[PDB]
Structure formats: C-alpha cells, structure tokens
Swiss-Prot record:
Induction: During mitosis. The mRNA encoding this protein contains an internal ribosome entry site (IRES) in its 5'-UTR. This 5'-UTR generally suppresses translation while specifically promoting expression during mitosis, when cap-dependent translation may be impaired. Keywords: Cell cycle, Cell division, DNA damage, DNA repair, Hydrolase, Isopeptide bond, Metal-binding, Mitosis, Nucleus, Phosphoprotein, Ubl conjugation, Zinc, Zinc-finger. Binds constitutively to TP53BP1. Binds CDC27, which is itself a component of the anaphase promoting complex (APC). Binds PIAS1. This is DNA cross-link repair 1A protein. The gene is DCLRE1A. May be required for DNA interstrand cross-link repair. Also required for checkpoint mediated cell cycle arrest in early prophase in response to mitotic spindle poisons. Possesses beta-lactamase activity, catalyzing the hydrolysis of penicillin G and nitrocefin. Exhibits no activity towards other beta-lactam antibiotic classes including cephalosporins (cefotaxime) and carbapenems (imipenem). It comes from Homo sapiens. Its main location: nucleus. GO terms for biological process: cell division; double-strand break repair via nonhomologous end joining; interstrand cross-link repair. Expressed in brain, heart, kidney, liver, pancreas, placenta and skeletal muscle. It is found in: Nucleus.
Amino acid sequence: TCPFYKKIPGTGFTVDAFQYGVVEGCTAYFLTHFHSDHYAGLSKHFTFPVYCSEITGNLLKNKLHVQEQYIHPLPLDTECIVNGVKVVLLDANHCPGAVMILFYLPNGTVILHTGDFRADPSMERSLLADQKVHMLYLDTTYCSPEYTFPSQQEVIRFAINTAFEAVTLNPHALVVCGTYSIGKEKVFLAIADVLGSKVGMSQEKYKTLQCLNIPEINSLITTDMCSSLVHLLPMMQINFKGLQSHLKKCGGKYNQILAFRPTGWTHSNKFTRIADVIPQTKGNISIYGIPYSEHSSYLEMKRFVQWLKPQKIIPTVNVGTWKSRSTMEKYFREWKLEAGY
Ligand code: NI
C-alpha cells in the first residue's frame, strides 16, 4: 500500500507512486524523474494521466512504451492547472528531466515536493522566492553531518586533468566510465571533449541519451566503439575482472585502462580532499572512485531549508528505521532554532 509521504493532501494526487497498483482516490500520478525506484510500475498498460517534465515524457514514450495519450508533459517555470489545482515544475539539479513540484491547494496551503534534488543557491531565485511554503516533502538522502562533498565542478576538474594526463603519457590507454541510470553525463562528456573523442556505448544507452534534448549530442556520443577512446559500460563491469575482459575485446587497440566510478559518497571524504584521491590498481588497470553527487550534501540541504523556512518537513528518504527518523527530526529542530523560525 502507498506510503503517506507519497500522497498530497487535499488533492487527488500522488508523487512517484507507480508500484502500488491502483491507488485509492488518485486521479493524477506525478513522476519527478526517470529513476527506477521512482518509476517502478509504469508500462504500455498504464491508462491513468501521468504528469512530468518534457524529457521524462520522452523517456516514458520511448523506453517504457507508455502511450502518448496518457503522458502530460509540462514546461518548467510555468503556472499550469491540473484537475483544478495550480502547479509549477522547477529544476531539481538531479538527473536530466528531474523536477521539484509546487502545489497551490484551493484552501491556500502551498506544498513543495523536492523529488530527488541537489540544493543550490540558484534555487533561491526561481518562483520559490515569491511565496510562503507550509509543507516541504524533502529528499533527505544525505541528512547527516558526515556527508560533505566537493562541488561537481571540482570533481569534473579532477577527472579531466587525470584522463588528459594519462592519455597524453600513453596514447594507447582506454578510458572507461561506469553508468547505471541517467545522471552524471558530465563525467563522460567532459572527459571525451578534452581528449577530442566521442563516447562509445551500446545501442540501448545511445537511444536513452537521444531522448534527453542535450544539445550537440550527435556531436559527443556514438555506437562505434572502434573510433572512440572513452567507453561507457554498466557500473557492474567496473572491476578488475570486467575491465580485463573488456580490454581483451578491443583486439590489441589498447594496452591500459583508466576507469572511473562516479559514486554518491564514500567515507574517504571524511579524511581526504579531492586533490588527494588515488586509484586502486592491478596490472595495467586503474579504478578511480570519484564523489560526484546528484543529491544535496548535509550543508547544502541545511542552507535550503533555513532559507525556505517551511512550517512542516516530511522526509522522503531514510524513513524506514526509528533511529534514522529520530536523527533527522533532531537536525530539523536545530536548523529551526538556529534560524529563528
Ligand atoms: Ni534519483
């Protein structure tokens, strides 16, 4: 059955609730983004209205075969009316197509559902600046002070410099980047751009990326693995055995692999700066775990909330244990006391 934190009171709406069958009294199903924990349940047999971004809708039509008549894409940063309720979609700074949803209830309550997000001060100048929020349904993925991470920009600087140096020293090295869902495309696109190469990938992954409106994508991606020195592989193949095997498949075009695993967080962050990151190496294969996150750090999250000053916070992540829930609730109290709301 559907959890309460996926239900929008005073409406017929749900958010990211497609794995529960027909939800009682739900007249419209919102999808914040195309990640499997959120879309789980959608298919060509779904016949209720789905509201989402343009990019998410492209992905529903092409990858899951949802019929066009049931997909209702909305433009961003635009007041729209859904079953008599005003809504606005905002950029969530997550993966492509990912949104936050603002709901303006008939009785005057205003609700912000962040979906998955990486808070940023640029959000303090959208349609959020323009009114009060009574309830915040918050992506609390990294809601603990140990989660610190660098900027996406610092992480991409590290990756480009590392790959550029490696291929300059050995023009026969291959660079590999792991992926398992949309998101984190800057990793592999920025490396390919500095090396003067396209990113080679499976036909299935190329079709996924063509669904995204990313300008100049014919320009950075390809299915011709032969002509490329940056290859994209499933995240599960980013280990010494998987990569030895891949190297064998390239027919002696290459003699070394430098691979990257963009992860959310790793406890190395508590003791190490980005400049100090080192790989795991075996033979002619090196693997770098880099802290490229598409979720808020603890400090980012805290800043957002102390700026927005919601009347009530409803966590959407880590809610399944009493200890985590209690931990989060204690931080929310601190933030409120410190900010004076
Ligand atoms: Ni996500």
